Amino acid sequence: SQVRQNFHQDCEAGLNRTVNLKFYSSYVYLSMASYFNRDDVALSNFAKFFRERSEEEKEHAEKLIEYQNQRGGRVFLQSVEKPERDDWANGLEALQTALKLQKSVNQALLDLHAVAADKSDPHMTDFLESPYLSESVETIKKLGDHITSLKKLWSSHPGMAEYLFNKHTLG
Amino acid sequence: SQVRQNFHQDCEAGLNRTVNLKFYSSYVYLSMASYFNRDDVALSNFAKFFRERSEEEKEHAEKLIEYQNQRGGRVFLQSVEKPERDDWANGLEALQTALKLQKSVNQALLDLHAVAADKSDPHMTDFLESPYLSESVETIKKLGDHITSLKKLWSSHPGMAEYLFNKHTLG
Amino acid sequence: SQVRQNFHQDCEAGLNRTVNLKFYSSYVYLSMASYFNRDDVALSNFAKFFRERSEEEKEHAEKLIEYQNQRGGRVFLQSVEKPERDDWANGLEALQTALKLQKSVNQALLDLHAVAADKSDPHMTDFLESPYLSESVETIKKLGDHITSLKKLWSSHPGMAEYLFNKHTLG
Amino acid sequence: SQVRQNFHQDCEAGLNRTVNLKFYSSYVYLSMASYFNRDDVALSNFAKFFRERSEEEKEHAEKLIEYQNQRGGRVFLQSVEKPERDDWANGLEALQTALKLQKSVNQALLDLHAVAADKSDPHMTDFLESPYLSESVETIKKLGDHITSLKKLWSSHPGMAEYLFNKHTLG
Amino acid sequence: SQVRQNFHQDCEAGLNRTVNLKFYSSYVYLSMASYFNRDDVALSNFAKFFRERSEEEKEHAEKLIEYQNQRGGRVFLQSVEKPERDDWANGLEALQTALKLQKSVNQALLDLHAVAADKSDPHMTDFLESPYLSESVETIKKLGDHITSLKKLWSSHPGMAEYLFNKHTLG
Question: Cα C7 to chain center, whole Å?
Fold first, then answer.
């Protein structure tokens, strides 16, 4: 690329890997959002929450793809694996997996950032920090809060827990 | 001070003491507000409530400092002791300590008022009465109400108690 | 904390230390602002300037406390030491101490940043840079300018220096 | 008076005495305001300041007279003595006498308040406190500030002192 | 009365009796509203509800007094007995007594109406029907609904029952 400058191939490859990870995340969130809209689950706000998280990960994936081009990198798309499960049991379990997924996505961003810094790319490093890295801690803290509130109610009544959380917290 | 008139040194000293007490109160409220924002506590409105109470005590402290100057008094700042604890257990316990703290602050204002009246200072006496003394009884009554509502739910379900109170009462 | 990820204990501890430093700074600025409102000092704008600087440091302290929570850190509050003096002599002396205080706060932020980078935390590093680090150099440059202007007048007339500076520069 | 209740004759007499004192104050302020408008003095803002203080004391006198009637008291007007001097030398001297006059007016209000409390009249006591007593400390502090600023410049240059103060502070 | 026409003395006397009954009702409602604002009860909306019911009964009493005059009747006021109790135990008990009180007030209106019809007074009869008689059935039905909702929750949890009802139904 005539545009390419100070863009290492490990940064290029890492970008493609993380791009796939972001699509995989949105796919997982889409799976969760669909499960909650089931007539036998009926947690509308839980679904909306996972639906938004889905669009957000997709959006990131596209901004990473767009970043690949801006730097003169070449984007190579891989297949996106389906979620580990089609049934997410309940809201607490759904929230818990989301937190784990967020932490792995964050770990991926942190690792890529490391290689970017390693190769002395202040631009990529800066790009990853905001809003990617910042968004992760915000979402992780937010998920962590939701799980706490749900757990406090879960002990009282699980069925009512999801219902209340669904109306008041995710509403 | 060329401005000083009918301002007794016991009133001056009492002002400085109470000023420190107000900073100490806001510091305690700040401590409580921080505890409730913890991911493992997650009571957003409880935190907001203590955060406001924090700014309010700080504001009073500054208006007392400003009053010290207006009367020709000299303000002497002391160190502000850290709160008795960093972990406030729960909302009921947090509310209960707040009530006790408010009552001691009120007792301090009442005592200072007494010395002001003793030294025949109608100005200081008037100054303490509103909004300092009035604000205390309002807040104490309000805290007393909150504790009652929380206690009624606590018996039903403690986890749900804080959650409901947090959304409906402190919201 | 279920939220905690890539958050080293040295970063956690450093955060608590710097938090106390920020409260200490606002307390010092509050002390200066009170001194200037004395009937025998009467530099209204000097006071307003230090009053704003006071609220700004307090605000930072709270955003650091809030950051501690977001990362899954636990905030531990220490007592906040009173300012070194209750009488700040004059405006030049007051401005000079402010500059020294700002430089030590900046040095603290720079050191914390260093440990953050050392532990490979791109998030904290990013967080410290703006607005904390940027705010410091802005304020330090601004204080440096004020001192220069005051010094130029001081040679002409000290009493008039503070008066003019107070009306024109800090006004 | 069919209206009179819990209104002691010492409170009634004290009211008439203080009423005369308020007229005397406005007369003194009027004297000062006139001196500053002299072509050979020319301190327009100093004059405006004393002119306002004049109207303010007059207004108080009338509100005290109105209070006398409301309580069923009978107002007895005495002659109002002319000011001690027709030439007020300069702004510093003028400001210094104003401060002394304000302190004597304040002392009168404080004494009357004392007799009101002595006779157990919560109404009069309340009436004196605001805005009479509060207005005094505000004005005394304000005068005290003005004198300080003027004195700082006076040492530099007296002629320029009044000119600057006149434009910037009293403007 | 030169105005009096087709106004029987039994209607006149019945009016005075019912007037006292209306004051007695508002007094009872005032008692209930005060009990709920106690710091140890803290049911703000329950209090507001009884406070409104209080003003409504008072208003009716005055419209009956005004009606007495319009017809050329002479109003004779009797003493208004204090409520049967100062402590209303809880919300369910409070609501239950309100329903009983409403039914006795309704019974009084129905009886008076009967004497009005008996004496062939189409005007009074019409006057009682709206809004007095209509207001009663509306309020009685409304109270009946509230008691049902409260009772359904009471079985689940009494403390939470009053809290929820207080926020959602009476809110």
Answer: 25
